[PDB]
Design a protein around this nucleic acid. Sequence first.
DNA 1: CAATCGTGGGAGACTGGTCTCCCTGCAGAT
DNA 2: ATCTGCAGGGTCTGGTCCAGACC
DNA 3: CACGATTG
Lengths: 163, 163
Amino acid sequence: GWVIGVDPDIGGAIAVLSPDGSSQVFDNPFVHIVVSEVIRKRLDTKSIIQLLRGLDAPPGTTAYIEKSSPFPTDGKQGWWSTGFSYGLWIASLVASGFSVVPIASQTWKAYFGLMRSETPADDSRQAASILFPDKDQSLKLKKHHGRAEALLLAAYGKGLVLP
Amino acid sequence: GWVIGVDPDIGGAIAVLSPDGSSQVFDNPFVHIVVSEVIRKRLDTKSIIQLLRGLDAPPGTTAYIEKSSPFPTDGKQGWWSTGFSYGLWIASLVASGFSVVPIASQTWKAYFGLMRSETPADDSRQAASILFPDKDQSLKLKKHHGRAEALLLAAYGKGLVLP
DNA sequence: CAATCGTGGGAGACTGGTCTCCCTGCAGAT
DNA sequence: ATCTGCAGGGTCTGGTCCAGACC
DNA sequence: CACGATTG
Ligand SMILES: [Mn+2]
Ligand SMILES: [Mn+2]
Ligand SMILES: [Mn+2]
Ligand SMILES: [Mn+2]
Protein backbone atom coordinates (compact mmCIF):
# COMPACT_ATOMS: atom_id res chain seq x y z
CA GLY A 1 0.00 0.00 0.00
CA TRP A 2 2.68 2.57 -0.96
CA VAL A 3 1.63 5.22 -3.51
CA ILE A 4 3.32 8.36 -4.88
CA GLY A 5 1.57 11.34 -6.45
CA VAL A 6 3.39 14.05 -8.46
CA ASP A 7 2.10 17.45 -9.58
CA PRO A 8 5.10 18.27 -11.80
CA ASP A 9 4.81 22.07 -12.27
CA ILE A 10 7.07 24.69 -10.67
CA GLY A 11 4.60 25.18 -7.80
CA GLY A 12 3.86 21.47 -7.68
CA ALA A 13 4.61 18.82 -5.09
CA ILE A 14 5.20 15.12 -4.54
CA ALA A 15 3.07 13.20 -2.04
CA VAL A 16 3.93 9.82 -0.54
CA LEU A 17 1.27 7.58 1.07
CA SER A 18 2.34 4.63 3.22
CA PRO A 19 0.48 1.41 4.16
CA ASP A 20 -0.17 2.62 7.73
CA GLY A 21 -2.17 5.58 6.35
CA SER A 22 0.37 8.28 7.10
CA SER A 23 1.22 10.83 4.41
CA GLN A 24 4.01 13.17 3.43
CA VAL A 25 4.02 16.03 0.93
CA PHE A 26 7.06 18.00 -0.26
CA ASP A 27 7.13 21.17 -2.34
CA ASN A 28 8.88 20.71 -5.68
CA PRO A 29 12.51 21.90 -5.27
CA PHE A 30 13.41 24.76 -7.60
CA VAL A 31 16.22 27.23 -8.27
CA HIS A 32 16.34 30.74 -9.72
CA ILE A 33 18.25 30.90 -13.01
CA VAL A 34 19.07 33.61 -15.57
CA VAL A 35 17.42 33.22 -19.01
CA SER A 36 17.54 35.96 -21.67
CA GLU A 37 18.68 38.46 -19.00
CA VAL A 38 15.74 37.86 -16.61
CA ILE A 39 15.16 35.52 -13.65
CA ARG A 40 13.10 32.33 -14.06
CA LYS A 41 12.16 29.48 -11.75
CA ARG A 42 13.24 26.03 -12.90
CA LEU A 43 12.87 22.71 -11.11
CA ASP A 44 16.01 21.64 -9.27
CA THR A 45 17.09 18.31 -10.78
CA LYS A 46 19.70 17.30 -8.21
CA SER A 47 17.40 18.09 -5.27
CA ILE A 48 14.58 16.05 -6.80
CA ILE A 49 16.77 12.92 -7.20
CA GLN A 50 18.10 13.27 -3.60
CA LEU A 51 14.46 13.60 -2.37
CA LEU A 52 13.45 10.49 -4.30
CA ARG A 53 16.51 8.64 -2.98
CA GLY A 54 15.49 9.54 0.57
CA LEU A 55 11.95 8.14 0.38
CA ASP A 56 11.01 5.00 2.31
CA ALA A 57 8.76 3.87 -0.55
CA PRO A 58 10.23 0.62 -1.92
CA PRO A 59 11.25 0.00 -5.55
CA GLY A 60 8.30 -0.71 -7.80
CA THR A 61 6.00 1.65 -5.89
CA THR A 62 3.70 3.28 -8.41
CA ALA A 63 4.00 7.03 -8.95
CA TYR A 64 0.99 8.76 -10.47
CA ILE A 65 1.97 11.92 -12.34
CA GLU A 66 -0.37 14.45 -13.90
CA LYS A 67 -0.21 14.24 -17.71
CA SER A 68 1.19 17.31 -19.42
CA SER A 69 -1.60 18.99 -21.39
CA PRO A 70 -0.80 22.64 -22.14
CA PHE A 71 -3.56 24.72 -23.67
CA PRO A 72 -3.15 25.81 -27.31
CA THR A 73 -3.63 29.40 -26.08
CA ASP A 74 -0.75 29.01 -23.60
CA GLY A 75 2.41 30.56 -25.02
CA LYS A 76 5.40 28.65 -26.34
CA GLN A 77 7.36 29.15 -23.10
CA GLY A 78 4.48 27.50 -21.23
CA TRP A 79 4.73 24.54 -23.62
CA TRP A 80 8.53 24.29 -23.12
CA SER A 81 8.22 24.42 -19.32
CA THR A 82 5.44 21.89 -18.96
CA GLY A 83 7.39 19.60 -21.31
CA PHE A 84 10.65 20.13 -19.41
CA SER A 85 9.08 19.60 -15.98
CA TYR A 86 7.33 16.43 -17.18
CA GLY A 87 10.50 14.91 -18.64
CA LEU A 88 12.63 15.82 -15.63
CA TRP A 89 10.15 14.16 -13.23
CA ILE A 90 9.50 11.07 -15.36
CA ALA A 91 13.21 10.33 -15.77
CA SER A 92 13.92 10.97 -12.05
CA LEU A 93 11.07 8.65 -11.02
CA VAL A 94 12.11 5.85 -13.42
CA ALA A 95 15.77 6.21 -12.42
CA SER A 96 14.79 5.97 -8.75
CA GLY A 97 13.00 2.65 -9.22
CA PHE A 98 9.38 3.75 -9.45
CA SER A 99 6.72 2.63 -11.91
CA VAL A 100 5.31 5.76 -13.53
CA VAL A 101 1.62 6.07 -14.41
CA PRO A 102 0.51 9.28 -16.15
CA ILE A 103 -3.02 10.40 -15.19
CA ALA A 104 -5.09 13.08 -16.92
CA SER A 105 -6.26 15.97 -14.78
CA GLN A 106 -9.77 15.15 -15.98
CA THR A 107 -9.52 11.63 -14.55
CA TRP A 108 -8.70 12.44 -10.95
CA LYS A 109 -11.00 15.48 -10.95
CA ALA A 110 -14.04 13.48 -12.10
CA TYR A 111 -13.14 10.76 -9.59
CA PHE A 112 -13.42 13.20 -6.68
CA GLY A 113 -16.28 15.24 -8.16
CA LEU A 114 -14.25 18.41 -8.83
CA MET A 115 -15.15 18.93 -12.50
CA ARG A 116 -16.36 22.41 -13.50
CA SER A 117 -15.94 24.35 -10.28
CA GLU A 118 -15.91 28.12 -9.99
CA THR A 119 -13.04 27.88 -7.45
CA PRO A 120 -11.08 24.76 -8.51
CA ALA A 121 -7.88 25.37 -6.50
CA ASP A 122 -9.72 26.15 -3.26
CA ASP A 123 -11.83 23.01 -3.80
CA SER A 124 -8.73 20.86 -4.38
CA ARG A 125 -7.29 22.05 -1.06
CA GLN A 126 -10.61 21.38 0.67
CA ALA A 127 -10.82 17.86 -0.78
CA ALA A 128 -7.21 17.06 0.20
CA SER A 129 -7.84 18.45 3.71
CA ILE A 130 -10.76 16.00 4.13
CA LEU A 131 -8.80 13.03 2.76
CA PHE A 132 -5.70 13.89 4.87
CA PRO A 133 -6.80 15.80 8.00
CA ASP A 134 -3.27 15.78 9.43
CA LYS A 135 -2.21 17.87 6.40
CA ASP A 136 -4.84 20.52 7.23
CA GLN A 137 -2.30 23.11 8.41
CA SER A 138 -0.16 22.52 5.29
CA LEU A 139 -3.08 23.34 2.96
CA LYS A 140 -4.37 26.67 4.31
CA LEU A 141 -2.58 28.98 1.83
CA LYS A 142 -3.86 29.46 -1.69
CA LYS A 143 -0.34 28.74 -2.99
CA HIS A 144 -0.71 25.26 -1.40
CA HIS A 145 -2.90 23.91 -4.17
CA GLY A 146 0.06 22.09 -5.67
CA ARG A 147 0.43 20.15 -2.43
CA ALA A 148 -3.30 19.38 -2.61
CA GLU A 149 -3.06 18.18 -6.23
CA ALA A 150 -0.17 15.82 -5.42
CA LEU A 151 -2.13 14.37 -2.46
CA LEU A 152 -5.28 13.89 -4.55
CA LEU A 153 -3.26 12.19 -7.30
CA ALA A 154 -1.84 9.79 -4.75
CA ALA A 155 -5.29 9.37 -3.15
CA TYR A 156 -6.67 8.52 -6.59
CA GLY A 157 -3.99 5.89 -7.13
CA LYS A 158 -4.67 4.35 -3.71
CA GLY A 159 -8.44 4.31 -4.24
CA LEU A 160 -9.37 6.52 -1.28
CA VAL A 161 -12.89 7.99 -1.18
CA LEU A 162 -14.34 11.20 0.23
CA PRO A 163 -16.83 10.70 3.15
CA GLY B 1 39.97 11.12 -19.73
CA TRP B 2 36.29 10.16 -20.11
CA VAL B 3 33.77 12.49 -21.75
CA ILE B 4 30.08 12.13 -22.70
CA GLY B 5 28.39 14.17 -25.42
CA VAL B 6 24.56 14.28 -25.75
CA ASP B 7 22.54 15.63 -28.65
CA PRO B 8 19.14 15.34 -26.91
CA ASP B 9 16.63 15.54 -29.81
CA ILE B 10 14.58 12.65 -31.22
CA GLY B 11 17.17 11.93 -33.92
CA GLY B 12 20.01 12.68 -31.53
CA ALA B 13 22.63 10.44 -29.99
CA ILE B 14 24.98 10.00 -27.04
CA ALA B 15 28.73 9.65 -27.59
CA VAL B 16 31.23 8.33 -25.03
CA LEU B 17 34.98 9.01 -25.34
CA SER B 18 37.32 6.65 -23.38
CA PRO B 19 40.83 7.77 -22.21
CA ASP B 20 42.46 5.32 -24.66
CA GLY B 21 40.98 7.31 -27.58
CA SER B 22 38.25 4.81 -28.41
CA SER B 23 34.72 6.11 -28.95
CA GLN B 24 31.16 4.85 -28.97
CA VAL B 25 28.01 6.54 -30.21
CA PHE B 26 24.43 5.34 -29.68
CA ASP B 27 21.27 6.57 -31.35
CA ASN B 28 18.76 8.03 -28.91
CA PRO B 29 16.26 5.26 -28.04
CA PHE B 30 12.67 6.14 -28.89
CA VAL B 31 9.17 4.63 -29.01
CA HIS B 32 6.09 5.36 -31.11
CA ILE B 33 3.15 6.63 -29.05
CA VAL B 34 -0.39 7.89 -29.71
CA VAL B 35 -1.09 11.59 -29.06
CA SER B 36 -4.36 13.20 -30.24
CA GLU B 37 -5.11 10.17 -32.46
CA VAL B 38 -1.83 10.37 -34.44
CA ILE B 39 1.54 8.66 -34.00
CA ARG B 40 4.49 10.58 -32.48
CA LYS B 41 8.11 9.67 -31.76
CA ARG B 42 9.15 10.14 -28.14
CA LEU B 43 12.40 9.40 -26.33
CA ASP B 44 12.36 6.08 -24.46
CA THR B 45 13.02 6.88 -20.80
CA LYS B 46 13.66 3.32 -19.60
CA SER B 47 16.09 2.50 -22.43
CA ILE B 48 18.02 5.72 -21.90
CA ILE B 49 18.58 4.95 -18.17
CA GLN B 50 19.63 1.32 -18.96
CA LEU B 51 22.07 2.66 -21.62
CA LEU B 52 23.59 5.12 -19.06
CA ARG B 53 23.87 2.28 -16.47
CA GLY B 54 25.79 0.10 -18.97
CA LEU B 55 28.46 2.70 -19.69
CA ASP B 56 32.00 2.14 -18.42
CA ALA B 57 32.50 5.87 -17.77
CA PRO B 58 32.99 6.39 -13.99
CA PRO B 59 30.75 8.61 -11.84
CA GLY B 60 31.62 12.26 -12.00
CA THR B 61 32.39 12.02 -15.73
CA THR B 62 31.25 15.20 -17.41
CA ALA B 63 28.37 14.99 -19.90
CA TYR B 64 28.14 17.89 -22.33
CA ILE B 65 24.59 18.42 -23.59
CA GLU B 66 23.41 20.90 -26.19
CA LYS B 67 21.33 23.62 -24.49
CA SER B 68 17.75 23.81 -25.66
CA SER B 69 17.13 26.95 -27.74
CA PRO B 70 13.99 26.63 -29.87
CA PHE B 71 13.35 29.38 -32.41
CA PRO B 72 10.46 31.80 -31.72
CA THR B 73 9.10 30.77 -35.13
CA ASP B 74 9.10 27.08 -34.09
CA GLY B 75 5.61 25.94 -33.12
CA LYS B 76 4.50 25.25 -29.55
CA GLN B 77 4.85 21.49 -30.10
CA GLY B 78 8.50 22.09 -31.00
CA TRP B 79 9.00 24.02 -27.76
CA TRP B 80 7.34 21.24 -25.71
CA SER B 81 9.44 18.46 -27.26
CA THR B 82 12.79 20.20 -26.95
CA GLY B 83 11.83 21.03 -23.36
CA PHE B 84 10.78 17.43 -22.65
CA SER B 85 13.83 15.88 -24.33
CA TYR B 86 16.13 18.22 -22.41
CA GLY B 87 14.54 17.48 -19.02
CA LEU B 88 14.49 13.73 -19.66
CA TRP B 89 18.22 13.65 -20.53
CA ILE B 90 19.38 15.99 -17.77
CA ALA B 91 17.56 14.03 -15.07
CA SER B 92 18.75 10.69 -16.55
CA LEU B 93 22.37 11.95 -16.58
CA VAL B 94 22.33 13.38 -13.04
CA ALA B 95 20.62 10.24 -11.69
CA SER B 96 23.32 8.07 -13.26
CA GLY B 97 26.09 9.98 -11.50
CA PHE B 98 27.29 12.16 -14.37
CA SER B 99 28.15 15.84 -14.11
CA VAL B 100 26.05 17.78 -16.64
CA VAL B 101 27.34 20.80 -18.58
CA PRO B 102 24.97 22.48 -21.07
CA ILE B 103 26.75 23.81 -24.18
CA ALA B 104 25.16 26.19 -26.65
CA SER B 105 25.29 25.09 -30.28
CA GLN B 106 27.07 28.34 -31.18
CA THR B 107 29.90 27.41 -28.81
CA TRP B 108 30.89 24.02 -30.20
CA LYS B 109 30.28 25.15 -33.80
CA ALA B 110 32.56 28.19 -33.46
CA TYR B 111 35.16 25.97 -31.78
CA PHE B 112 35.34 23.73 -34.87
CA GLY B 113 34.82 26.56 -37.37
CA LEU B 114 31.37 25.40 -38.51
CA MET B 115 29.54 28.72 -38.14
CA ARG B 116 27.62 30.00 -41.18
CA SER B 117 27.73 26.96 -43.44
CA GLU B 118 25.31 26.42 -46.30
CA THR B 119 25.31 22.68 -45.43
CA PRO B 120 25.66 22.45 -41.63
CA ALA B 121 24.54 18.82 -41.24
CA ASP B 122 26.92 17.54 -43.93
CA ASP B 123 29.80 19.55 -42.43
CA SER B 124 29.15 18.13 -38.95
CA ARG B 125 29.46 14.59 -40.29
CA GLN B 126 32.66 15.42 -42.17
CA ALA B 127 34.16 17.03 -39.06
CA ALA B 128 33.19 14.03 -36.89
CA SER B 129 34.54 11.63 -39.54
CA ILE B 130 37.93 13.39 -39.35
CA LEU B 131 38.01 13.46 -35.55
CA PHE B 132 36.84 9.83 -35.26
CA PRO B 133 37.90 7.95 -38.42
CA ASP B 134 36.77 4.60 -37.02
CA LYS B 135 33.22 6.04 -36.93
CA ASP B 136 33.36 6.89 -40.65
CA GLN B 137 31.01 4.04 -41.59
CA SER B 138 28.59 5.21 -38.86
CA LEU B 139 28.36 8.67 -40.46
CA LYS B 140 27.69 8.00 -44.17
CA LEU B 141 23.94 8.72 -44.11
CA LYS B 142 22.51 12.21 -43.86
CA LYS B 143 20.30 11.13 -40.94
CA HIS B 144 23.53 10.39 -39.00
CA HIS B 145 24.10 14.09 -38.26
CA GLY B 146 22.83 13.50 -34.70
CA ARG B 147 25.59 10.96 -34.14
CA ALA B 148 28.02 13.57 -35.52
CA GLU B 149 26.67 16.27 -33.18
CA ALA B 150 27.04 14.01 -30.12
CA LEU B 151 30.62 13.14 -31.12
CA LEU B 152 31.52 16.77 -31.77
CA LEU B 153 30.06 17.80 -28.39
CA ALA B 154 32.16 15.16 -26.68
CA ALA B 155 35.20 16.18 -28.77
CA TYR B 156 34.66 19.76 -27.59
CA GLY B 157 34.59 18.63 -23.99
CA LYS B 158 37.79 16.66 -24.50
CA GLY B 159 39.57 19.59 -26.18
CA LEU B 160 40.28 17.70 -29.41
CA VAL B 161 41.23 19.73 -32.49
CA LEU B 162 40.77 19.21 -36.21
CA PRO B 163 44.08 18.53 -38.08
C1' DC C 1 14.26 2.89 -45.56
C1' DA C 2 16.30 7.40 -46.46
C1' DA C 3 15.65 11.82 -48.19
C1' DT C 4 13.35 16.24 -48.86
C1' DC C 5 9.92 20.00 -48.06
C1' DG C 6 6.98 23.66 -45.86
C1' DT C 7 5.24 25.58 -41.79
C1' DG C 8 4.90 25.96 -36.85
C1' DG C 9 0.41 22.80 -35.13
C1' DG C 10 -3.83 20.48 -28.21
C1' DA C 11 -4.89 16.63 -25.81
C1' DG C 12 -7.79 13.66 -23.18
C1' DA C 13 -11.77 10.82 -21.38
C1' DC C 14 -16.33 9.26 -21.84
C1' DT C 15 -16.95 4.05 -35.06
C1' DG C 16 -17.20 10.54 -34.40
C1' DG C 17 -19.10 14.01 -30.83
C1' DT C 18 -18.55 16.66 -27.00
C1' DC C 19 -16.87 18.85 -23.38
C1' DT C 20 -13.16 19.43 -19.91
C1' DC C 21 -8.44 20.30 -18.48
C1' DC C 22 -3.00 22.51 -17.30
C1' DC C 23 0.28 26.09 -17.01
C1' DT C 24 4.28 30.35 -17.64
C1' DG C 25 5.84 34.94 -17.18
C1' DC C 26 5.28 39.24 -15.95
C1' DA C 27 3.20 42.88 -13.52
C1' DG C 28 1.24 45.28 -9.44
C1' DA C 29 -1.01 45.64 -4.68
C1' DT C 30 -0.55 44.73 0.11
C1' DA D 1 5.65 36.73 1.70
C1' DT D 2 1.14 36.08 -0.47
C1' DC D 3 -2.26 37.11 -3.67
C1' DT D 4 -4.26 38.68 -7.98
C1' DG D 5 -4.62 40.09 -12.94
C1' DC D 6 -3.65 39.55 -17.92
C1' DA D 7 -1.78 37.58 -22.06
C1' DG D 8 0.80 33.86 -24.12
C1' DG D 9 6.19 35.73 -24.72
C1' DG D 10 13.71 33.41 -27.72
C1' DT D 11 18.08 32.62 -26.24
C1' DC D 12 22.89 32.67 -26.53
C1' DT D 13 27.94 34.14 -26.85
C1' DG D 14 31.62 37.04 -28.13
C1' DG D 15 33.02 41.50 -27.45
C1' DT D 16 27.55 48.28 -19.51
C1' DC D 17 24.36 47.06 -24.93
C1' DC D 18 25.13 45.57 -29.29
C1' DA D 19 25.38 42.20 -33.02
C1' DG D 20 24.94 38.14 -35.08
C1' DA D 21 24.48 33.31 -34.42
C1' DC D 22 21.67 28.90 -33.53
C1' DC D 23 17.95 24.62 -32.70
C1' DC E 1 14.14 21.62 -33.73
C1' DA E 2 8.76 19.06 -34.49
C1' DC E 3 5.29 17.54 -37.45
C1' DG E 4 2.97 15.63 -41.16
C1' DA E 5 3.45 14.96 -45.40
C1' DT E 6 5.73 12.88 -50.32
C1' DT E 7 9.38 11.14 -53.20
C1' DG E 8 12.11 7.13 -54.97
MN1 LIG F 1 -1.26 20.19 -12.04
MN1 LIG G 1 -0.21 22.30 -9.93
MN1 LIG H 1 21.28 19.39 -31.61
MN1 LIG I 1 20.52 16.96 -33.54
